[PDB]
Structure formats: structure tokens, C-alpha cells
Design an enzyme around this catalytic site. Structure first.
Site, mmCIF file in Angstrom:
data_model
loop_
_atom_site.group_PDB
_atom_site.id
_atom_site.type_symbol
_atom_site.label_atom_id
_atom_site.label_comp_id
_atom_site.label_asym_id
_atom_site.label_seq_id
_atom_site.Cartn_x
_atom_site.Cartn_y
_atom_site.Cartn_z
ATOM 1 N N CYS A 140 0.875 -1.163 0.000
ATOM 2 C CA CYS A 140 0.000 0.000 0.000
ATOM 3 C C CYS A 140 0.914 1.216 0.000
ATOM 4 C CB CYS A 140 -0.846 0.007 1.270
ATOM 5 S SG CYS A 140 -2.182 -1.197 1.249
HETATM 6 C C1 LIG Z 1 -1.324 -2.671 1.623
HETATM 7 C C2 LIG Z 1 -1.392 -3.941 1.055
HETATM 8 C C3 LIG Z 1 -0.584 -4.771 1.826
HETATM 9 C C4 LIG Z 1 -0.052 -3.985 2.813
HETATM 10 N N1 LIG Z 1 0.819 -4.382 3.832
HETATM 11 O O1 LIG Z 1 1.211 -3.554 4.634
HETATM 12 O O2 LIG Z 1 1.159 -5.602 3.880
HETATM 13 O O3 LIG Z 1 -0.496 -2.722 2.688
#
Ligand SMILES: *c1ccc([N+](=O)[O-])o1
Lengths: 140, 149
Positions: free
Chosen positions: B86
Site C-alpha cells: 500500500c
Molecule cells: C497494503 C497492502 C498490503 C499492505 N501491507 O502492509 O502488507 O499494505
């Protein structure tokens, strides 16, 4: 004619499966939440009302191979079912016998396959077939 | 009949001028799809490992952000079990001024500076917050197991 690569298509299907669609009578998700290849999925179909499948939850295994979605996924019922196009000894879905698979297009998806199987459970040639006992599953 | 100039340009400039520590090559069937290898950054528990990442330029690129995912298992509070991240600049903060390159060295920076404080960090974050030494050793262990071949 921009093609979305297999892995990104399956990421889209993962998100859609988590959001759910329609009335929730079909659902799908990854079989192994650590499977980075996004290959093995669990499918669920609720047997439709006023058929001999009614009030049963069917579990399926759906495999999206290296050529998906250019090629259809492989599908097998885990829950025992008597249904045209499904091998009644192994649960394997015969692609040639299920139109969405036999006539696969790259616009289709796991959701479409499961919705098609549920529609076919309502067919005249399937809805009255006497079923195996509830809850039984195939071996393997 | 073909790709936008921007994409022709970004691709050609990638193969002419790679980001240090990052290999990035277009797919043999899809000119919008790239197979990336990111070296674990110097002084991180990922150092010495190589990590596969895939990148896709969707129809609306560069209006729309590129899509990325790791395809090598990695122990990191911002990369999940399926390789998803993310990254602000891939969503809320995306704009056409940013390029693929910005995205790649930014992902390398994320490997260099894990952020277990992020609202969207995965379940590894608690270990990273509370026993950082152990979390870093586990990151090194997973580099040995999954990122050396
Ligand atoms: C958004 C998608 C996966 C993540 N993560 O922190 O693993 O963040």
C-alpha cells in the site's frame, strides 16, 4: 486490446471475492492465503431452491493455471453431486460439457463459472436428479 | 497503432538507464507488463537477496497508477503474504508527473526503511514494533530461505 496479465487479473478476482457479489449465492476465495501464485481457489455454490440441490452448500476447487484467463480454469466439486457434466465418481467438471468452459472467453472469471454452474443446477435435466447424501465429499 | 510515446520512452529509458540495484525487463507477450528484480538494499536484513516484483501499466496509464506486486516471499510489515503493498504514491498520491522509476526506487526505499507504524501495516507489524531485533533476524531468515536463488 490491452490484456491484463494473469496475476493482476487474479488480484482483481481476489478483491471482488472479498467484496462479494449479488445475493451471495456464489462465493470464491483463495484456498491458501500464502499462495503468491494465486492458483488454487475455493468456490461455493448454494444449491438453488426448488431443485434437488436446494438447501445444500457445495464446495468446489478451482485451479487457475498459467494460461488463465486466456484459458478456462479447471474445476472440480468437493461436495458430492449428481449433475450432467460432472463426473459422478470424482467430481471433476468436464469442460466440454459445461458451455461456459467449452466456449470460454477471456472476459469470463471464477464468478462467471460458479454462476453458470448454479444456473445449470436449475436445468430440466439436472434439477430432478436424485442426489447423494448431504455432506458427502469425494476422495483426494 | 501502438503504445503511447510516454510508454515507449519510459521502457526504452529503463533498459538504457536502469535504477542501480533494480533489473526491469518487459514481458515476452505483453508490452505493458514488466518483470522486475530488486536487490535487497545495502545495510538491510534483505541485503544479498533478490526479490521478484511484477509491474503492469494499465490502459489509462499515466492517468492511472502502475500496478505492482512482489512475487518473492518477504518478511516485512508493509508487504503482505501475497506480495501486495500500500504505497501512497500508487494510490492517493499518484499523478502523471510521477514515473515508473519513481515507483521502483520508492519500493526499494520501503525495503530499506520498513514502517510498522503505517495504519495499513500487515500482521508482522506488531513483532517489528515490540521486538524489532527478532523481526529483523526473521527478515534475514526469510531472505536466506526465499531470496537467494
Ligand atoms: C497494503 C497492502 C498490503 C499492505 N501491507 O502492509 O502488507 O499494505
Amino acid at each position: 486490446g490491452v490484456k491484463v496479465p494473469r496475476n493482476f487479473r487474479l488480484l482483481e478476482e481476489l478483491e471482488e471475492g472479498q467484496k462479494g457479489v449479488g445475493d451471495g449465492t456464489v462465493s470464491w476465495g483463495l484456498e491458501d492465503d500464502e499462495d503468491m501464485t494465486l492458483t488454487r481457489w475455493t468456490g461455493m455454490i448454494i444449491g438453488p431452491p426448488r431443485t434437488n440441490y436446494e438447501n445444500r452448500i457445495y464446495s468446489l476447487k478451482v485451479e487457475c493455471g498459467p494460461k488463465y484467463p486466456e484459458a478456462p480454469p479447471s474445476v472440480r466439486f468437493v461436495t458430492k453431486i449428481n449433475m450432467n457434466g460432472i463426473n459422478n465418481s470424482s467430481g471433476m467438471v468436464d469442460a466440454r460439457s459445461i458451455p461456459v468452459l467449452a466456449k470460454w472467453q477471456n472476459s469470463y472469471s471464477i464468478k462467471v463459472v460458479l454462476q453458470e454452474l448454479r444456473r445449470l443446477m436449475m436445468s430440466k435435466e439436472n434439477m430432478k436428479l436424485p442426489q447423494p447424501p448431504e455432506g458427502q465429499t469425494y476422495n483426494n | 497503432a501502438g503504445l503511447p510515446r510516454r510508454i515507449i520512452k519510459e521502457t526504452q529509458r529503463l533498459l538504457a538507464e536502469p535504477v542501480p540495484g533494480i533489473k526491469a525487463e518487459p514481458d515476452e507477450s505483453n508490452a505493458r507488463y514488466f518483470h522486475v528484480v530488486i536487490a535487497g538494499p545495502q545495510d538491510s536484513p534483505f541485503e544479498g537477496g533478490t526479490f521478484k516484483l511484477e509491474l503492469f501499466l494499465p490502459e489509462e496509464y499515466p492517468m492511472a497508477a502502475p500496478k505492482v506486486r512482489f512475487m518473492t516471499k518477504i518478511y516485512h510489515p508493509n508487504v503482505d503474504k501475497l506480495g501486495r503493498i500500500c504505497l501512497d504514491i500508487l494510490k492517493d498520491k499518484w499523478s502523471p508527473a510521477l514515473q515508473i522509476r519513481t515507483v521502483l526506487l520508492s519500493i526499494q526505499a520501503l525495503l530499506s526503511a520498513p514502517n510498522p507504524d503505517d495504519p495499513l501495516a500487515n500482521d508482522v507489524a506488531e513483532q517489528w514494533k515490540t521486538n524489532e531485533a527478532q523481526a529483523i533476524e526473521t527478515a534475514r531468515a526469510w531472505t536466506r530461505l526465499y531470496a537467494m536463488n
